[model samples]
Target: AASGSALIFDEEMSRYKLLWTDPECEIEVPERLTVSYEALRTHGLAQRCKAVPVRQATEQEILLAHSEEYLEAVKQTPGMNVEELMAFSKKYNAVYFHQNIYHCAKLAAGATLQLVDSVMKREVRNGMALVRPPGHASQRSAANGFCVFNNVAFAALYAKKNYNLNRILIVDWDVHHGQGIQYCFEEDPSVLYFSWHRYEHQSFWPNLPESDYSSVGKGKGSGFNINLPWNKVGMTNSDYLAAFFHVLLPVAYEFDPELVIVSAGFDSAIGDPEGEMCALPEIFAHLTHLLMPLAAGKMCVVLEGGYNLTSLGQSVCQTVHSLLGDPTPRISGLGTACDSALESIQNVRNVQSSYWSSFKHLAQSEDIVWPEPLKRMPASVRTVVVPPPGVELTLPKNCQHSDISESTAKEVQRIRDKHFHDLTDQNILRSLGNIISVLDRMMRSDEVCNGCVVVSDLSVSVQCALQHALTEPAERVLVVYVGDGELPVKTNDGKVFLVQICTKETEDKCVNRLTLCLREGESLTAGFMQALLGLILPVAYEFNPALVLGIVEETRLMRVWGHMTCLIQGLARGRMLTLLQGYDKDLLELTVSALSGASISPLGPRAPKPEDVEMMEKQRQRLQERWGLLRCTVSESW
Candidate 1:
């Protein structure tokens, strides 16, 4: 049932990069954001899922959590000059300001609203929000830590107000403590805030003076505000497990939350530069699995923190897999244990024993086993196998353009020329880039490779091939045949050329013809393979250089040159081997399917009828009469 859990990513998260400064505090945006973007791109998951860019919360919605005066202050600051706005935000403890921040925040809020709607309508069992400028650290009065609005806090409040749902749990596992969420609900018992964060006394940033395990909520909220602080680095899987078994589970079970929200943070994963904790990525999934049964699968995970690109990417992928009911793979790439892990677990266990007494049934026995092997593990337990790129061939649908009549061809060419004319102009190139960017976003939900090359003398066929190739899965495809000539191949060293198709006798003749036809005459020694491959290699390079190279070794040439199918296969195979042997692991394997005239058939009445088949069989028998079988047996149970 967990496999049915759906995911919704807010594409507005992409704009988060535009709001952040570089690590060096320079005005330039950070590359980590782009890396994250690419990671999302690699899986094609974002393409497959439903992404909704919701508008920012209206003034009425903002008032649900923030004061009217504070809202006015936030709105007014944007109209001020740059220096004035910067000073205003600094004084208000909101360090970052962007022109579109309000718009982006609204979009994020809408996405969450959509998720809540889906849950309420039973369209999805549970969901995760791949949001950014994380909301856990934002409070009612002001934003902090690159966050302008509390997306989750507002969503939770909205859900409570609209749906009359009372019991809500906010589990913030961000490496950094959730001071904002805790402060927001410190005096309210309706919202339970459970957080675990590094507590190195004054060493950590935004040091929480009141997050000690004993600092339970005061009045109605007493025993609801749970904080388990870590004194040092080096938290492993077992340490996290201990917290769940000894503290979170028993307490959360007793609280009996109707809806659970996880502030999913990848910073705890090993190798995170910000947080030195070394827990594996699988632990997050494991934690998700543990919580699923209790909450009846009403869970929403919002992105928080993780600076290391690889760790963050892997951890997020693993969490998604776990949410989808897949088992967590054993993590790899961590070192030995940290003493702080067990100590933190013990501290929380000791402090929470009083409140956890209501759930004695959930207690572990005295012989409770501790996880062995203190070694750090990979942030993610799953292996994502990237296949070698190959071109996807999409058959024409609806027969809308199948006829390829003269009028249709002319119309298609007119459209093509309109786009391709002035290809060498800088203004056109810039416009093309903008078009590509918009298309990229529109096609983000579809796998369309920009790295596809197609060449043909027939513009119509080339255009169709390009469209089909772009829509398919392949990283690159080279469709070459301008006028009438063999395909070309560049030498490994890039100094020579060879023809991909043509007979031994015809190869020299074709080369001579090409030499005479070319504006810049070709060399006499240039073989057909060299000449044909040379023309295509530049185009292929513009596509993905890493994709396995393919050359259409048409059957006509193979047949005419006395080359067998086996020989042709060997040639294609060898080309693939040469192209992909040392390429990136992500490069896909190459495959070449030969097309032949013998296999071609007319659209109408291509197959013989039964009577025609019988006549053909008689003709065959007459030809093979001398070689016919000596005996034949026919029995009907006689």
Candidate 2:
């Protein structure tokens, strides 16, 4: 009746932090609520929201999703002493109970119901509940994981029992698999539970064979529960987008859900040690907005778990901002889903094809004879080098910086000259911007310009390229700095977006500056080089960069530079160019090999540094604030 968005929160819900030392449960803190709420207020998100106060879920409401024993057991936790509380927690396998937890858990469930009630009544378009003792992991019979009560599970039950709703959808994007929800609704067809979690093939925490995509559902719930598992960490934004575009959104549209319940977990976002996801906070805005169009705006979001305070707060803000009506932040990257993400999407579709028509098409593709996804090295990793197609490396004989003189433009012919295709039909008029797509095109077909550039002045060449982009006919341009060096130049109004990646550490950097710093390996290894194609390219593709400008002439960047050629080729059909100095002869061979469709060999070891992982997290924190991508990792600590 009043405004659009509803905010359901009680200042008292911050009483569920762990008091004992269970390493797994310690990260779940009360500050998770306080920081996110403070952020909502600080960012002015709370003001835009209609305040929906929290209340305790009645016993009957609690029984809707949980068994009587579980309810009575939670009640007993309040009286248990320290030793008794810890013992009860182990029985649930990761739950920690305090005197105030039972009360807080009820409030969490109640808050979720309040938002659902508001959304269903049309008091607001959509709403979000910030609750603690995150509930997605709690089962009907037992408290599991960090959850004390099944907040979302009970919300779905409340919606169905109270509102007589059907076709309810629960989307869980937490880093860990929410096995409790699956156990509760795996046999219920009315509720569609879709979750994507950090499942390194049963290697990650709460390791369960059921987390695999193959476990669609049982009996009446068959085909209802969809699980997209991650085999590795260091997942980026493209992975999340791929799951949405290929998996979640497709089926959601088909199901035409009457009410959407989002288990909005920030641990799947970047900077969460538990999640190791690269998805920035801004992606939540996009995810929230994407779901709004469904259910006729009847959607309720409930908090689960997110440990990183900065990312947790920002992600919550993004969710509130979107619910309140805000534009989705722009994403960076060229365009293409990561190989792992694609494979995960493919397998889930295959498993669920028997249930959903949306997936049957792909499931039946290749006569339903799709071989088991190819296995990899012993570690929990996805594909590396796809064996089917030819990949090239191109090295120019001599090129100075970011430009090519008119003489070099004509004289520097395609190094390989393999296809011998006509250059007149191509779009690269000048040579400043590295056309990342050229290689992608040449791989698909046999036509592209494989020449490199020499720049007289770095700043001038980039400026000219930016100016040329408006009339260039391409959708957008991405200028990338692969190794150490600065643009020392700025392109305001974003006529062009610049991405600076440093292999070595510098003073500092941020994602908004189009700057990303990765502490990667010095030498490329057989397996390590996969990060370039899998990690970097996934991010680059989502950015949708039409043309790419490689702005560095790093001599010590053998591994990085070799990987760069692959990165460019993987981008927009190879509409790319590299701007480097020195014009080294060694680079010429790599360039020629790149253009000739040759696979790169390991030029160095695959040793990675801690500083590298730290640097990547730093860049992602800023990058994700501006971009809507979700890719993240398995912390080496695991």
Candidate 3:
């Protein structure tokens, strides 16, 4: 939704393929391109976007990274004997030298530049290019990992050199690391490289040391290089989203990238042998959606590596639809981030915080800093574990603990007293009676459509909210909870649907409810807000709740508040009621603003725990029976 979208594709790009016999490199087939483009046509997305034709990149342009010697040798490939061609392959890794290989590689790199120029010139908001012999791992002098010219790297450099652009972000989501792109921009601050690949702690392919998170950069680019080395395989959608939230988005926004380029690799998606990942096709839509608001929608996506045609086709279609500005498909039962994902993301944040403004002032936690010797070693060699940032427990500012003295109580309570939601709890530290017994009057008043409730006590807030929600005029009330704690109120009746967010493993055994458990110790970083948008908003929109009630934990953090605000902004047509217990003058002003549907700062990543995932699945299956809109999974009808 910035300018119009562009589709730069041509059948000729698939004219070349792997000429030699090797199963490892044989999966990069022509069908990968045909099926992806076909899916776009079948979905009617092809006709909706503006089409840009592909052209060959000039020798001068190719020299941006390649040497004259490399070009001269590649030009000799067509005339070489089979023995020579096969022998020449030894110069490269996982790459075959067919007669048409050079031509196709040039086209791939050229087409990428064209897409970049389109977005930069304001001809289109964003676009995608389908290229053969996927690039990313490709280097300046030699091809590697079945990639030839590093199309994405060339595009970033082309954008900077030809268009005079600054601040470009390259996100390589391939299951394998793109050492080529990282090397090119490692010392150049103009481009920030982010990638998460199949790394079993340096045991995976291209197991270069720089692929780890600690290899930030050589010089000025020190903070620009971000790597999340996955220690395990079989990662899911939550893992990917978690890395984006906690590691990528915060730094990208802080860097304020001018253009975004995705090394759009589908192998990392579900059902791919190379990736061995379980992320679904619909997840790509959310990934594209997450990047939409950045760089004013100026983005160019170039296909990198994908094998499984089934998942690749669906994933490509999802990406194209999202790039065309379609509403992201709804996802369900996304509970928490996995342990491996948690470790990878935390390492990135720890190493990158000092470089970018986004993470520079990260809300500090009690988690201890890395040891002196460990901090100096490369991130790959020196592994240190810090538990996820737990909830920041502080009372309201002033009265006693919870820091709620007279001034804070007055500020928070004053705002709460002015809203429609009611919480006249006796167990509260100082409260005895209703602050303002205007519930009936306010509900009837047209101007007082949505409001908040200040819970003087944590138990009191959850307790009081449940009783009043059942009696409230609104039908189908949806109550959302944040943080890890025992909620005293337990009424999972049809009148109310509950969705709780916390990192600890917990079940939503109660009826008509959902629990999203994030990885233990992972703080409410960037990913937390992603789940709210991708998982929570879609369900809430479909459920069409008459009222949204919020029940927060005793120790609240900005990480928690920011995500809640994101959800509140979405419920414009519905009534909002925040039954929150707070000890704050700082947060008092924030609560009413969020309750009024206003956005605050960005929320950091919060990984979902195993309990959270299981609870989400259980809740979705149970509620879908009563409400068709509650179906969170992508189906044939969708």
Give the candidate number with the greatest TM-score. Answer: 3
Give one digit per residue, the lDDT tens place, for model 1 in 438-506. 223222322221121121222322333334224433233333221234333323332222323322323
The ten-residue window of minimal lDDT in model 3 covers 374-383
Q: How much does candidate 2 score in TM-score? A: 0.60
Per-residue lDDT tens digits for candidate 2, residues 173-238, read: 888888989889989999999999998878897899998999888998898999999877867766
- Residue 190's C-alpha lDDT in candidate 1? 79
TM-score of each: 0.53, 0.60, 0.63
Q: What is the lDDT of candidate 2?
A: 0.65
Candidate 1 residues lying further than 4 Å off, grouped into runs, are: 1-3, 16-41, 331-338, 358-638
Output the lDDT of residue 608, model 1.
18
Error at 487, model 1, angstroms: 71
The per-model lDDT (C-alpha) reads 0.47, 0.65, 0.66
Total colliding residue pairs, candidate 2: 57
Off by over 4 Å in 3: 361-638
Residue-level lDDT of model 3, residues 252-351, one tens digit each, is: 6556677889999999988787888888887787687667656766779999988888888888888887676443444544544666676677677777
Candidate 2 ranges beyond 4 A from true positions: 1-3, 365-638
